[model samples]
Target: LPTLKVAYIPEHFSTPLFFAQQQGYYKAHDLSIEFVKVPEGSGRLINLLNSNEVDIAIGLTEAFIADIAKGNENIHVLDTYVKSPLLWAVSTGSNRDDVTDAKQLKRIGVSRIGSGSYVMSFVLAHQLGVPSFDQFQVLSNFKNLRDSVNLKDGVEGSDAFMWEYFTSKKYYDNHEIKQIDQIYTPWSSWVVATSSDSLQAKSDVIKNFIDAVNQGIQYYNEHVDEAIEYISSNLDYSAEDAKEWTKTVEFNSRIGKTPLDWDTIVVKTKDTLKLAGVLAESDDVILKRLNSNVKKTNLQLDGDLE
Candidate 1:
């Protein structure tokens, strides 16, 4: 049996996969799976895929798009996982009054260069009409932002960061960080990514892996209470935090159910990157590039079942 090396960011958004693995769903599909955590960021995760270190990776859709445009054609985006725009909140290291506006945000922190935090910083900066995105220096090499957000132990003069709302709630509650601003991508936030080599060599295994994940989603949607319980017990989240986090997440059981119009997604994403001063090609070129590599799977997995 071949083992599918899957990579994902360590956060509540990925807990359903853990639930699926814990419940033996992958075993039922005759697939051996290993979920690797890439907390450093999506850029590093994509690097792992490019290096053939990981067969599959789940991460922000924009990172995959950016990489594809940069000529890394070995990968294909398979499907949308999180059906809503990711809720990325901007929080300040000091009191809310300390930084009254975006111009006052001297330093920003991110997981990595192409991670959600990095891209979203530019988006948020543009939204706030900041003089220049470059005005705020970025701290973008963290394995996890929790420690990096700490004023005493983390980066000095780190004024702002954008991360998932629920995961950053405790700091907001404890007054360590103050919620200042927020932004959401116009399309689904996370997507399933796989290498073309893996697709050609182990298409069946890939399909089975997605099937198991769909089962995990089905179970999660049906038994929200139990899912929350599992998160509280298995993850580092308190029950209260888990419950609050569930409010922001919408899991889809059907494969290939992209939460937004493809054309709009492509156009808006291209525009977002352009505003961030990172777009490398024309709209039509980007469209062609993405359409050339995007792969949609129409697999009918078992329905919501215990």
Candidate 2:
């Protein structure tokens, strides 16, 4: 039997998988599964899955899109984040700076050009009246923007990005990071994915994993604190941080559900990409490419809007 190596973010939001593993549900399902925490981003997870370094992945939806654009076939986006919580923050002294308004954020700190922070930078700027992503220059390196902001002493590449509300706050205070703006996530955050290479071959395993996760989510909703403690204990997170983090996170159990509302996703994705100058313009062709990419992945994600 081949062991299923799963990768996900090392955060409280990923507790359902941890709890399921702790409760031996994966074993009950006859799955030899191991969880890898990504303190990084989904691109890394996708690279691992594509290379067969891992069997499946829980990662960002945008990374999946980028993979498809690169011509990798047989991959699919399995799930959508229940609630994409994206909070935009700036550094300490930069707090009172005019850059907080988004319009004046010509110089800011972001994870990368196509990262979540970069995406949010354009989105927030668009919301605050910036004309385009080129309206400001962006730094293409760095992943953890909150920590990066602290080290840089202010904005660098561009201005602003998004992250979990509470976790960002904790890291901010712990490292003396600053907050300039708060922008909620407009795109789906979490998705289950497998390489095009093994998606069909591993369909059974994927189904079992989904069912097990559903069970875990049901348990999580009823026992939030238990899930919180499990994550803290295993990942070495603080009890105070775990408890506080749990409250800020909203869990969803939409396994084997219909696809996400592509309209909303496309609107935000196109707008963000267009601002970033990645898209010439938003058109039906791009939308079709996106729609077909999700279908090809054979991901069976469905559930309520929740």
Candidate 3:
């Protein structure tokens, strides 16, 4: 059996992938899938794909756009993995007073320059009419986001930062950070990204891989209780939180089996990247490059998984 190394962030959103592996859907499809954990905000997954360290990866659409803008041609988005726009919360240090006035905000914190945290910082800055990056600083990777935003050890850090809603819920409840604002993307937040070379070398295997994930998604939707149980056990999340997350988050495993509306996603993402000064190309040039890089597949699935 052929082995496909799949890299993904280890989060509640990836439970379907876990289910697919656990249930032997990949094996049934005549493939062996190995899950590799890539740290959030590292931009390492895409890097790995570019260097052929992994065959495929899952990550935020914003990061993929940035990678493409930077001339990465080895990978392309296969499909939307999460249908729901990411719920991002802008939070301030625990000791800092609630920021009612956007102008009063000193700086924003992020995990890294090319990560989703960085992209969302630009989004928030554009929303507030502030200078991007100039007002946002990179914190101590993702592991320290909670503490960094809360003014750890009375040491001053970025006055504010943005992170995933559910992941930061515990800090919010504990009053370690103050929720200043929130934002959501207009397009799909997460996507399956694969190496262009892999697609060329193993098209059938990749298609079946997608089909297996779709089955996992279908199973997850049908067995919400079991999914909740598995996610809660595998991750650090409590059952209550997992249950609530299931009700709030949307999955789009079937997206792999259809054509994507690239015009919408590209237009919106390009506008934001341009506004943030991340993409230097003209609209026409960027659109052409993006159009060339996109690779779509229609696995044997139709309609909503639910």
* Highest-scoring model, lDDT: 3
Q: Write the per-residue lDDT of candidate 1 for residues 143-249, one digit (tens) a residue.
A: 23544445545455466678877767777787777677778876677778888887777776887888788898887888789878888887778999999788878
For 54-115, candidate 2 gives per-residue lDDT tens digits of 77788766667656544566556665544454444544333435444444555555555666
Best by TM-score: 3
Alpha carbon deviation, residue 142, candidate 1 (Å): 6.0
Q: What are the runs in model 2 whose C-alpha is more than 4 Å off?
A: 92-103, 133-164, 264-267, 280-285, 296-306
TM-score of each: 0.84, 0.80, 0.88
Q: What local lDDT does model 2 show for residue 156? A: 47
Model 1 CA deviation exceeding 4 Å by range: 101-114, 129-132, 141-159, 256-261, 296-306
Could you tell me which 10 consecutive residues in candidate 2 have the lowest summed lDDT? Answer: 90-99
On residues 1-306, what C-alpha lDDT tens digit does candidate 3 reach at each position? 357889889888888888887788888888878788986532788888888888888888877876776577776877778877788887776677655544566766777665667777778867777666576666656557766666676334677777888877777778777677888875677778788888677666777888788888988888899999998898979988899999877788556667666754566877777766788877777776777776544644335873
* Clash counts for the predictions, in order: 0, 19, 0
